[model samples]
Target: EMNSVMHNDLKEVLLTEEDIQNICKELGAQLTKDYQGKPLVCVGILKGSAMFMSDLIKRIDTHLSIDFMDVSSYHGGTESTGEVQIIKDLGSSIENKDVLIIEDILETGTTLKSITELLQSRKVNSLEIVTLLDKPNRRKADIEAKYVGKKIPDEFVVGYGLDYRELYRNLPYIGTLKPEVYSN
Candidate 1:
């Protein structure tokens, strides 16, 4: 039998396929209006935001570009080490582009804040963030996303492009990882 104690099944679907489509549509429309007359370059941090990055850009209806940055502030399995490191750099310089760094979750803000400062060092024309999940209660660094989908309590969430041990990200919606699963 499966290890039900360390791994439990989904309890509910927070953002189904349809829900995701609507969110993308709305966010894209707003982006289209905002950057209608500017160069846009979206920087997606790899490993985690891969699934979200691919789907989000297609729905955005503006003349834009994309690049990937493989960065990690996490180590040792599922905990945030809180020390930022740059594993990959952008293929093109972002000196004069409107930058939108898409993230799966705006958690403690260490990663996001560090990323912003790193890019700012390059003198990008403009910068902002768009996150799928925002847990203000857990925010440590003073930061905010110009666009957000939902405000959730500080809980261990997995799915809709978020995961633990790369297992639950394939789930269609966001949901809490049951306590019994991670109590070990």
Candidate 2:
């Protein structure tokens, strides 16, 4: 399955399956400890964050509620438009509740920063971000993630929930796609 997924699609593997598992384990343990005895809500951004959030919450040994928010700054292209729109909002009120935003990647910080501000407006007790990958060099806003699984280069990556034109998200490991795949 893994071999088939990589066939002529990727340039090079960035993060292996073990690498993601290890990071998730470490982050989960830390979150379990930090949010102990606190009303915690693990809110993940839709689609991309799904796989990471699912794997992470299992490792967390604390009581918590899970939710998903779907927001988009880029509809399907590589570059972000710097305009954020909430496709799906949280169903439950987070007022006075500890909120943790789980995301797949932190690139320009446009989407994450906007989402954070929106959550802040809800009067949550606390709000923090955790992302599987971060591309600090591409950041346009001064946003930071409290928990980062890996700091990656400014390359277009796909796998483990990250996608390129809605493809490659099912790959177990993260990888850079062939330039021709996106170059038209």
Candidate 3:
């Protein structure tokens, strides 16, 4: 499935399908133990966190709720402008709820940090973060995710919900994109 969709767009597979799935199971198990007695609400940051949140929630055995927030910084570029916009907001109130922000990547931390502050202002009972990938070298903020699946190198990646111009997200595996592909 991945091969068919990502044939030439990807430079090399950074994380295989099995790699992501196994991590999800591990993270899900840990979250289940950590939030055993709490009202957990997973806030997925779309559209990158879509695949990760779906797989992760399936592995989680505890009773929890899920929501999505469509935010953007890069319109069609490789770097973040340190500016974030909320395209969509959560439908219901998160007051006094244990909120877990599920993110696709933790680079620069601008988006997540801004969102964390916003959610905190809403008077949530507790707040934490879980990210599929963490690119620490690129972080411009001092934020850290509670659960990180993997630490990746400083490269532009796509697939498994990450994208470029809204493409390549259908691939089941994550990979670095060829520089020439985005040189324009």
Candidate 4:
């Protein structure tokens, strides 16, 4: 019943539900063909990466196992703060496996970089990052995702698993948050 009411919290829509589906579909096909017959493990960085990873793995159409990790980059506001740490680690060992890290956004990139480096140290055969949203202007770490679905500006965003103060994760699309909502 609260479905459309969440719409009021937005200032403008960036990507509609359909837009994300299309992007995931294309990436899935590409991954399915590229990694055909290869041993692959997808590690989704949680909270933010959850929703997008769900849609993506369904369209993958290939044999793969999925796992989740909870990494928190200390922050209370729109900007990322402090060092990153793994709240929850992967369930299974990725030794000698080709791993893919799925994330919702690439902003400062320090969190992503830290996770990727930790995974790489595990002796994986190969590893790469794939993110749905990229904030190119906000990168602070020397890292890049091999696959990116879309790039957005430096504005604070919400919905589709991204959030401001842990709200709007259930919204079906992504958008810039209204400025008034934050100064409260």
Candidate 5:
């Protein structure tokens, strides 16, 4: 099934499936080495992170465990609303545990920054972040992911779980929306 509608609104190819897989494998290896025997908790943000988390954690050669958190900060907008609202929180307390937050994309940084702060206040022993895509050009906060699948342009992109009005997330490839397609 075609994940994206592709309405005459694509800019250019940003990254490919092979590109994403290779990066994810590399990240897995890194995580495997870093958390070998450590009690690691990889918290995947709901919705978008589902796909990226599945690919990454399976390839990770570690005994680490995983969890999920639901967060939302954007709603049918090109930019963030600058507020973090938690629809869900960690099921288990992360105190004194190595915590990793996995996300689909890092754009305004508000979502990650807010989540990190919330986790940190819980007194977790260590904290880190991983993201599939990054748009540094659009970052409104200084938050950055420790591991990234790719750094992309500031343009609004959707695919591999990223979306527009909650659509196009099923697209296998990431693409910029056409201006005309969105203007409607």
Candidate 6:
């Protein structure tokens, strides 16, 4: 009876929705405490950070505004093609804001490097990286996430805002896809 379309495509569950919720709740308290009376501008990297950002922000009981950025590896795919480009930037200036980069997953790291430099150029008062998942891969660039929900084995993953060909993001949990689902 536990069959759902999203689950059907999954190879197996990695992080259940409740597991994710607990992670967010833990980070929220830390963020709330650390960012106390400070200006926090959470910049979510889309279109992957949607679910994580939404969940984390609500848990953070501090007065912080949210913004989003859409970036790509120039040519789109699951893995980076080296060069990174910004498709969409923030609406407001982060010159004096403490910025947190919300990423769905951390890999390759070139994109994170690209985003970090861009934000630093904007003169953010403070900056840090926060990721929902860390699946270390062939990292060409050196970067580290300050707040991470889970560090998993290096494997292909989908769901929970991560995608395969821009699908499977609607799943409530994080998991790997059945090989057959993408082999075709």
CA lDDT of every candidate: 0.80, 0.89, 0.88, 0.88, 0.82, 0.86
For candidate 6, the per-residue lDDT at 115 reads: 83
Q: Which stretches of candidate 6 lie over 4 Å from their true place?
A: 75-82
lDDT of 5 at 41: 92
Error of 4 at 91 (Å): 0.7
lDDT of each residue in 55-166, candidate 3, tens digit only: 9999878889999898777534776655678899998799999999998898889767888989999999999999999999999777999999999999999988998999
lDDT of 6 by residue, 1-184 (tens): 4577667887889999899999999989989998988999999988879889999999888789999888777645666665777688899899989999888898778778878988899988999988988866655688888898998887789988999998888888899888898885
Sequence-dependent TM-score of model 4: 0.92
User: How many angstroms is residue 88 displaced in model 5 relative to the true structure, after the best TM-score fit?
Assistant: 1.3
Model 4 is weakest, by summed lDDT over 10 consecutive residues, at 75-84
3 or 6: which has the higher TM-score? 6
Candidate 5 segments whose C-alpha is farther than 4 A from its true place: 1-9, 74-83
TM per candidate: 0.88, 0.92, 0.91, 0.92, 0.87, 0.92
Off by over 4 Å in 4: 1-3, 74-82
Tens-digit per-residue lDDT, 1-184, candidate 2: 5457455788988999999999999999999999998999999888989999999999989899999988768645776666788788999999999999998898888777878888999999999999999998988888999999999889889899998878788888899989988898
Give the CA lDDT, 0 to 100, for residue 95 in model 4.
96
Reference-based TM-score, model 1: 0.88
Ranked candidates, highest lDDT first:
2, 3, 4, 6, 5, 1
As a whole number from 0 to 100, the lDDT of residue 38 in candidate 5 is 89
lDDT of 4 by residue, 47-119 (tens): 8898999999998887999999987777667656546777899999999998988889998887777788888
Backbone clash count, each prediction separately: 0, 0, 0, 0, 4, 0
| Model 6 alpha-carbon miss at residue 12, Å | 1.1
